Amino acid sequence: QVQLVESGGGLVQPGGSLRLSCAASGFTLDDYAIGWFRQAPGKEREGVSFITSSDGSTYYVDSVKGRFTISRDNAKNTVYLQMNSLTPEDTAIYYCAVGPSFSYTGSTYYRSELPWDYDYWGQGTQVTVSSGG
Amino acid sequence: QVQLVESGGGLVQPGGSLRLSCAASGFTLDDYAIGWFRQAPGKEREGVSFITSSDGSTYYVDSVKGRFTISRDNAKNTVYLQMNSLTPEDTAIYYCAVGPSFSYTGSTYYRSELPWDYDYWGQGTQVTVSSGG
Amino acid sequence: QCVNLTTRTQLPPAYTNSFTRGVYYPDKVFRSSVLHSTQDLFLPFFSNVTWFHAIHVTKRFDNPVLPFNDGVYFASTEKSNIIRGWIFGTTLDSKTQSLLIVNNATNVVIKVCEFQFCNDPFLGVYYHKNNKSWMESEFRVYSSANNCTFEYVSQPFLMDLEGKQGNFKNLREFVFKNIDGYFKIYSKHTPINLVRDLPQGFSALEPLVDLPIGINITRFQTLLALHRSGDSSSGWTAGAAAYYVGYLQPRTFLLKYNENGTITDAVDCALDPLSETKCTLKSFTVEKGIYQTSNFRVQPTESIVRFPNITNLCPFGEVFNATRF
Amino acid sequence: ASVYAWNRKRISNCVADYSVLYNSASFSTFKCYGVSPTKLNDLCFTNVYADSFVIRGDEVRQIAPGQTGKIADYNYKLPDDFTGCVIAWNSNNLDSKVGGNYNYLYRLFRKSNLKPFERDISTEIYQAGSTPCNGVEGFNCYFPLQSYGFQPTNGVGYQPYRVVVLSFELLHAPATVCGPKKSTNLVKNKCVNFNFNGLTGTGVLTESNKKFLPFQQFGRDIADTTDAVRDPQTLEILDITPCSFGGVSVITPGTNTSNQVAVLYQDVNCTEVNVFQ
Ligand SMILES: *[C@@H]1O[C@H](CO)[C@@H](O[C@@H]2O[C@H](CO)[C@@H](O[C@@H]3O[C@H](CO)[C@@H](O)[C@H](O)[C@@H]3O)[C@H](O)[C@H]2NC(C)=O)[C@H](O)[C@H]1NC(C)=O
Ligand SMILES: *[C@@H]1O[C@H](CO)[C@@H](O[C@@H]2O[C@H](CO)[C@@H](O[C@@H]3O[C@H](CO)[C@@H](O)[C@H](O)[C@@H]3O)[C@H](O)[C@H]2NC(C)=O)[C@H](O)[C@H]1NC(C)=O
Ligand SMILES: *[C@@H]1O[C@H](CO)[C@@H](O)[C@H](O)[C@H]1NC(C)=O
């Protein structure tokens, strides 16, 4: 089985830096595509960033380009998404998603904002950005 | 496999009477729970009417109470939902849904407007009600 | 927390003779000016019932553990409401569900629940010399209840709570039965003006409740309220009271329903030949003559079986113990 | 209560108005397995156990007999064979607050799946991987409980839903709670078929002057035949007499003489059937 655990999140100040760690169990991080998705309340989840290729090439959505950086650590099987310049509009719950494995599919490059493309989904952690926080 | 075909729909005058027929293939209509669900654009689908029990007892949602009547014909393996006093608020796409079979589950009474409860989903047909129509 | 109670001498149990007592309505059926013969769990007439005292004088604090085989008759002669309730069960150690009835000066509590009963469960009313007020202070019966199924509390009420001076004035008669998963309580109250005995006369006991309990009850105890005004284990006054315990047996009774439907009189069918004759004739009055009452038989004992001796002994020893195999 | 710490109530020794909940249509999900609400009212049950918890609309699917889900596995487990009613109504209006109500918690991950009808209150850091948690936060070590966002504008699938499940237990011999009994109107002075407290009979009911006892319901005369019953509603005593029956005899002067006949109804006053009494 595949299990994804989300760590981090919570209230942060505007412009704050926050890192979300996705723990992976039962599968190799490098082989499978990794996508961090953001779900706003009452809205379908959308993928802010993706590990497009096994070697580690990454793509960032225009909204989160530069602000969001996704890094995969193979040794402990965890993917970290670092959020900078966070904003109230950015506030939403972030889900770690496992795409199809690169080796099995033969897909060198794989990026998909659509949630249904990624078969396995992590529970996700809510990230809140507020002026008070 | 289970396949559901939706027939009927289209533009109707306010107060018009329209019947939607759900064709069933590969399963017995009586044993499985039957739910007619309405999905508004931009909104999650909700079940207007349901065949709560195998013997044919039916429940109607308050919005469609009286106006909507659901009838199951086993011989012709089709469930017909009759809509009367149709209104622009009623305009939406209607899906025929197959609930879990009463015999296998042991459930005498089963009604659920929440979509995830019903295992099998028909494609659905759009029903439009307008003053011009 | 309940602790062992000291200052209790040992005295042999006293017995008394119940005279035509322990009759309850066996059914919900109305009957007028008729004689009905019913065979049910009744208390035999002119029977030995155990007597337990409660007197300051020892102090006679007697709440022993008594078996509950197939029904118990419970009489109480009181003047100050010393009796509080009863405990029913099989193990009384929270391993099997028990039953608890308590009238703790406020409500009537009927519970069927698992309790960690200790050796000395009781109630204590604490008396203050400064003001003329009595209220219950100590309630030491159980400690825990984890899996519990039946609870009942009646609406609140208040009584005197004081120890009056004189003889017993109230006689409370109860009958407890458990059959078919139903625990039935029959009750009756009577004003009496004697000093120390079991009153004569006849009084039918009306049903009180039919609790749907459905448990096994094989043993039981009673609850008493003491008076406090020294050490916790020594500074207690039992108060004047007496309670009588009898056991119910399956017997046939002939009951006389008057015009109003009350059981005016009753006779046994296994007390003496005249009562047996009355039972056979279905009448309280018998005409002169000879009546075929019943049958006498001798019951055999010591069943004996005989079979032929010197049966041919099969040769197990020559076949097992042989020189050559 | 939270879904992981689902709260169970015991209801017995009463009359259970299963129709009232059934008739009400407010509840979004009414899935009953092994029992029908109309049948529930007539049926008698020893003890019902109601479990109340708040979960997401998506997880309403998971909480069902024969349904596998992470919420079902680690928070509340429903046996497949079990017979009961699952009731879910949307709570997004009251539970949700603009900031979001995170007081509701659920067990994201647990070492083993919860056994049916078992509740776990353990709050120990879950241990993933070989390295021991040691009760301290670390890599591969996370608290099992996770809050629900429950925002007011949250999607209906994520919207908070209040679910109560009814568990009918017939294990204990008396059906103490069991169910209600609706009584028909009383009619007297006419031979009718009556069923009083399960006592069935046929006859004409009439007012009686005999006085029963407060605990005493019905009466029998000599030979154990019912004569009077107390109606439980108005605490009144009614006399029961069988309605008129008897023999019919034909009086004839002989067909050789005439064709006319007379009819005698024996022991039946015929005011209700040249009439002579
Ligand atoms: C098998 O072996 C011996 C060979 O001589 C036979 O003799 C019997 O041996 C027993 C040994 O003590 C003698 O008493 C026995 O002991 C216990 C006493 O508690 C008992 O279980 C038996 O009652 C048994 O008698 C015994 O005197 C002696 N003789 C006889 C006639 O039994 C014997 O014939 C052989 N037995 C079998 C079962 O093959
Ligand atoms: C059944 O329920 C009723 C209450 O819902 C219990 O008593 C009811 O009491 C009212 C008022 O006292 C009765 O209505 C009126 O009573 C007066 C006095 O008897 C009478 O003069 C009026 O004509 C009118 O009947 C009501 O009838 C009565 N309920 C009955 C008769 O069903 C009643 O005790 C309950 N029964 C049980 C067994 O719980
Ligand atoms: C027959 O019915 C009438 C009318 O109710 C009544 O007056 C009479 O006493 C009844 N019995 C007879 C005539 O024996």
Numbering used by the authors:
A (entry chain H), B (entry chain T): 1 to 133
C (entry chain K): 14 to 70, 76 to 247, 252 to 347
D (entry chain I): 348 to 620, 641 to 644
Paper text:
Here we describe the isolation of a nanobody that interacts simultaneously with two RBDs from different spike trimers of SARS-CoV-2, rapidly inducing the formation of spike trimer–dimers leading to the loss of their ability to attach to the host cell receptor, ACE2. In the prefusion conformation, the spike is a large homotrimer. The RBD is responsible for the initial attachment to ACE2 and is found in two distinct conformational states: The receptor-accessible ‘up’ conformation and the receptor inaccessible ‘down’ conformation. Binding of Fu2 to the RBD is unique as it can simultaneously interact with two different RBDs from different spike trimers in the up conformation.
To better understand the molecular basis for neutralization and aggregation of spike by Fu2, we used electron cryomicroscopy (cryo-EM) to determine the structure of the Fu2-spike complex. The structure revealed a remarkable head-to-head dimerization of the trimeric spike, bound by six molecules of Fu2. Our Fu2-spike structure shows the presence of two trimeric spike molecules, both in the 3-up conformation. This arrangement allows Fu2 to access all six possible binding sites on RBDs without steric conflict. In conclusion, for Fu2 binding and for trimer–dimer assembly, all RBDs are bound in the up conformation and consequently then locked in this conformation. Meanwhile, the other proximal RBD is bound through a bidentate hydrogen bond between Fu2 E44 and the backbone amides of RBD V503-G504. Interestingly, the overall structure of Fu2-bound spike had no significant deviations from previous structures, and we did not find any contact between any two Fu2 molecules or between spike trimers suggesting that the observed spike trimer dimerization is solely driven RBD-Fu2 interactions. In contrast to spike trimer–dimers reported for the full-length spike that are based on S1–S1 interactions placing the trimers ‘side-by-side’, Fu2 induced a dimer in a ‘head-to-head’ orientation with the C-termini at the distal ends. Targeting two epitopes increases the binding surface area, but, more importantly, when locked in such a conformation the function of each spike is sterically blocked both by the nanobody and by the other spike in such a way that the whole complex must dissociate for the spike to regain its function. In contrast, the addition of Fu2 resulted in a substantial shift of the peak, suggesting the formation of a larger complex, likely a dimer of the spike trimer. In addition to sterically blocking ACE2 interaction, the RBD-specific nanobody Fu2 rapidly induces the formation of spike trimer–dimers and leads to aggregation of virions.
